[PDB]
Structure 1
Amino acid sequence: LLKKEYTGITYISGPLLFVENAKDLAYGAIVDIKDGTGRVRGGQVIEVSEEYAVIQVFEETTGLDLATTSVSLVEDVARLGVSKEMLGRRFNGIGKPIDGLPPITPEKRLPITGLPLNPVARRKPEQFIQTGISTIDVMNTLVRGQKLPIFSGSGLPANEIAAQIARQATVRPDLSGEGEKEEPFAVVFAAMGITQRELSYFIQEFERTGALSRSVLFLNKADDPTIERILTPRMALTVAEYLAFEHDYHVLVILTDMTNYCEALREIGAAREEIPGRRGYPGYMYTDLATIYERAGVVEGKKGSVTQIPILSMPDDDRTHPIPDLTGYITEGQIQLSRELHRKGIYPPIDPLPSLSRLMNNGVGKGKTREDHKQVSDQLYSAYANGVDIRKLVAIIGEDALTENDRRYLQFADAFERFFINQGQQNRSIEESLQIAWALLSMLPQGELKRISKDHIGKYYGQKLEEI
């Protein structure tokens, strides 16, 4: 309960300072750095030795000095106090309220880094989330427990898609067979380097839909300290796991602009002169991102769940950039927006071909959705790939030279983009999306549907595009 203070500051440079006699500072401990003016700023121990301890200051080192600066221990392990009463609050990215309300009374203090989930303790994500968006529901299905990012661009509407998914996300027990009444999603929202325009959009949307009472918001703004950007997703996921696996909640985590997280990580790595990787990003960026992304899933013997929908803006629309590249190696698929579709006026502008969901098969078919889902999706993929290839051919050798089958594939590609992908702000149940899908597939000769068994073609083929 007592306070230990170290005054042997020997060196300050960039975001680091060296403390001389700090043998009792554990590796990874949190400290308070008090300035001559009495202002206190935080920091974490990143290396310790008999000679000195290297501290990483979360905010700029302006105003510190070697004569009147003192470092005090705060906790051996970076922890966060969590309570069910977190729902409906706002926090600043280090965990402190910015809602003008009294601080929470913690039921428990949890280490923010968390602990790895035992693989034998997990269970398979199998419950299908209905997002109301056909391009996701039919072709890139999301299931509870999944980690499915949105690969966005600079000026593209990824925030709109995230808000729409949060609004329309439902689980449809009627198809599954349990028949029990659903429960709503809690939303944990972590913002890193977010601008006021985007924050205003999100706050207004959540207020409009009433979800701001069943949500927790951690807001690191683009005017907030950069090194604090590394704590935000970890605190968000600590709260998410607490709620899900101790109170049986179904949480939906949105991490907006993970590109900002990776930029902060590069800043720190460059400061510490660690061995870089591909474009100056630290060689351990993959492990660091995994420690955030692999905190989703579903546990055996637990009713709750954690779904993650990270949002990252691909630099220069480049998919081979280290940030998207490493994310795609960790996450379970990705939803990639198309600048071309956006310029054509399509919302949501989700490109199917560079989009994938890896957990779709464990969430669709018999006893979940309806039996033709997987084959319909496969056939749509084949047809759209052929349509895009024929479109490439047409841009060289003109439309008039096309065979009639190729002309059909062209018409399919266009109708797809204009009726399946484009749906505005509408909420489509899985039944309506599958109906539209079969309507588009009916544009092709019944014999070219090689991915679908005969029975399904008989059952559903032949509906026109008269849907209204």
Structure 2
Amino acid sequence: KKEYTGITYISGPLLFVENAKDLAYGAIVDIKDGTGRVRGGQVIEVSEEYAVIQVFEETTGLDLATTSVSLVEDVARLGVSKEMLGRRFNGIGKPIDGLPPITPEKRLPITGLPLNPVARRKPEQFIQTGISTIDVMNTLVRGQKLPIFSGSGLPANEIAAQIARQATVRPDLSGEGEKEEPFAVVFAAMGITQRELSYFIQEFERTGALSRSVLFLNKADDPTIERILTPRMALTVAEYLAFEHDYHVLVILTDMTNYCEALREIGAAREEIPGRRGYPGYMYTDLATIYERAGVVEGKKGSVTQIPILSMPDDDRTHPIPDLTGYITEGQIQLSRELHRKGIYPPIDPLPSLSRLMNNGVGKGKTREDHKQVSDQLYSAYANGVDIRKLVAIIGEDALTENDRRYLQFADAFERFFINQGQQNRSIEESLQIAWALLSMLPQGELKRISKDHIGKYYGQKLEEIWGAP
């Protein structure tokens, strides 16, 4: 137990210690004060003269005469185990569920290593989230990074919880017919409040989804360094499970805006010159190191999928955070305040949403052979209906043709039945059924983007779907 007491400076979150050249850079330390309370810290800089430690909590009660500094670990590491499933952690790996600590199978550095580009393979298979707007029009493929763009007052937490407790894989659609690979969800929440914490605990406990999930929860009043460390620990657990036990892992990061703010605060505390808009100049690299840890690997059956969630600061898509997130990931799902105020949940706007890997995750060997054509037909028809709804305001309905009235009614019904699915869990077949029922409102020859065989096979169904699932 090496101990240091040569503290010569305390101010803000920083304290200096002398004759501490034995501390490795980036090490984790614990500071003991005069009363015996122990609080943690991290080495920010080490030199011959003195070392600089950033304190996790506030520096109340410290003094230069009694406090001492001890080493905990040279490199920040997390002890992972296959029995972490069903447990809750506080962002530094400490259980907060009231159960004894896990026995570590091994200890891994949370700053993982980059994947070899020649070791990756093409993402090929999809994930069923149970939300018809995502499954049909913005399909999520295993190994993809598909963020969700949210607003200030929009209900992103509800959507995150619903996706977490509804997502699953569909092997029988690919011809396998076997549920050989298990499915796990890693949920990381950064800078949440007590209300959100209680809501997430209740949601994961009431439906039994906790039995296949790992939760890293970091509250708003916790140290910001814990907020920095949380996604790295979550991704370390996800990678360990996926590439050492052949799991299919879905990772959800609840608020990347809080992470960016914490990163900016940490960078400012270390006296670094900011970049564009006052954010750190290395923010793109940090976001890339977080996001690029997902994927699929040649010779491995596991997979890692990420669904980052972030609130756009001023509903501005040119803000640095959404700009870089979209510049790294493969698309986005856009929430709409108009739909939310009109009473539609989940308020997902299909027109600005985009999935850049959807074409790989649909076809004849997976989902259904008419998936892509139905999706793009729905897109075009909804865009036309929305355009017509604006003109009918001024020129009146009776001045419109019959086809324009059909498009108007189709847009209204699409919003009322497709997007507004409530708390229901729709399979891909149910979503395609509802889509075909909606498309049948248009004339026989109006479905210009769909081949004749699929039209002859599926056209003509009536609307008897949402009424069967109250």
Class of the TM-score when normalised by the shorter of the 2 chains: over 0.9
**Residues 122, 298 of structure 1: 8 Å contact kept:** yes
Per-residue Cα deviation, 1:303-356 (whole angstroms, up to 9, x for no partner): 222222222222232222222222222222222211111111111111112212
Name 2:442's counterpart in structure 1: 444
SS of residue paired to 2:369: coil
Deviations 1:385-443 (A, max 9, x none): 22222233334544444343333322222111111111111111111211211222222
SS of structure 2 residue aligned to 1:224: coil
Structure 1 CA distance, aligned partners of 2:412 and 2:182?
37
Report deviation, 1:240: 1.4
Q: Deviation at 1:108?
A: 0.6
1:49 to 31, 47, 50: 47
1:143-198 alpha-carbon deviations (Å, 9 max, x no partner): 22222222222232222222222222121112111121255422222221212222
The equivalent of 2:453 in structure 1 is 455
C-alpha contact 2:144 2:357 (8 A) present in aligned 1: yes
CA distance in 1, matches of 2:318, 2:132: 27
* Inter-partner Cα distance in structure 2 for 1:396 and 1:204: 48
**Equivalent residue for 1:399?**
397
How far is 1:48 from its partner? 2.8
Structure 1 residues 60 and 140 mapped into 2: Cα distance closer, same or farther (>3 Å)? same
- Aligned identity (percent) is 100
The answer to whether the 8 A contact 1:59-1:227 is kept is no
Aligned residues: 466
Name the structure 1 match of 2:109. Answer: 111
How far did 1:466 drift?
4.1
The change in CA–CA distance for 1:183 and 1:13 in structure 2 (over 3 A counts) is: same
Deviation of 1:66 after TM superposition, in Å, equals: 2.9
Distance 1:72 1:410, change over 3 A: same
Q: Secondary structure at the match of 1:317?
A: coil
SS at match of 1:291: helix
- Given that 1:80 and 1:111 are in contact with CA atoms closer than 8 Å, whether structure 2 keeps it comes out as yes
Moved more, 405-414 or 73-82: 405-414
TM-score (norm 2): 0.93
Partners of 1:171 and 1:182 within 8 A in 2 = no
Residue aligned with 2:276, SS:
coil
- Structure 1 range deviating more: 113-122 or 31-40: 31-40
The structure 2 residue matched to 1:348, chosen from 346, 349, 358, is: 346
CA distance in 1, matches of 2:120, 2:51: 38
Cα-Cα RMSD? 2.1
8 A contact 2:135–2:428 mirrored in 1? yes
1:165 lines up with 2:138 in the alignment: no
**Are 2:30 and 2:39, in contact at CA under 8 Å, matched by a contact in 1?**
yes
**Aligned mates of 2:403, 2:49 — CA distance in 1:** 77
Query: In structure 2, how many angstroms separate the alpha carbons of the residues matched to 1:30 and 1:351?
Result: 45
Report the more deviating stretch, 151-160 or 47-56.
47-56
Aligned residues of 1:15 and 1:61 also touching (Cα < 8 A):
yes
Contact 2:9/2:16, CA 8 A, preserved across alignment: yes
Instruction: Supply the distance in 2 between the matched residues of 1:400 and 1:45 (Cα, whole angstroms).
Output: 73
> How far does residue 230 in structure 1 lie from its aligned partner after superposition?
0.7
Moved more, 427-436 or 455-464: 455-464
CA distance in 2, matches of 1:367, 1:163: 30
Distance 1:444 1:182, change over 3 A: farther
How many Å apart are 1:142 and its aligned residue? 1.1
Q: Give the equivalent residue in structure 2 for 1:266.
A: 264
Q: Is the 8 A contact 1:59 1:228 kept in 2?
A: no
**TM-score normalized by the length of structure 1:** 0.93
8 Å Cα contact 2:377-2:450 kept in structure 1: yes
Q: SS at 1:45's partner residue? A: strand
Task: Choose 414-423 or 279-288, whichever is displaced more.
Answer: 279-288
Alpha-carbon deviations, 1:232-265, whole Å to 9, x = none? 1111111111111112222222222222111111
Task: Give 1:218 shift.
Answer: 1.6
- 1:371 deviates by 1.1
CA distance in 2, matches of 1:76, 1:151: 38
Secondary structure class of the residue paired with 1:401: coil
Q: 1:446 to 1:54 in 2, by over 3 A?
A: farther
Name which of structure 1's ranges 192-201 and 6-15 shifts more when overlaid on structure 2: 6-15
C-alpha distance in 2 between matches for 1:220 and 1:467: 41
Q: Within 2, Cα distance between the matches of 1:281 and 1:298?
A: 32
- Per-residue CA distance 1:71-117 (angstroms, 9 max, x = gap): 22222211111111222222222111222222222111100111111
- CA drift of 1:138 comes to 0.2
Could you tell me which residue of structure 2 aligns to residue 62 of structure 1? 60
Unaligned runs of 5+ in 2: none
CA positional deviation for 1:220: 1.1
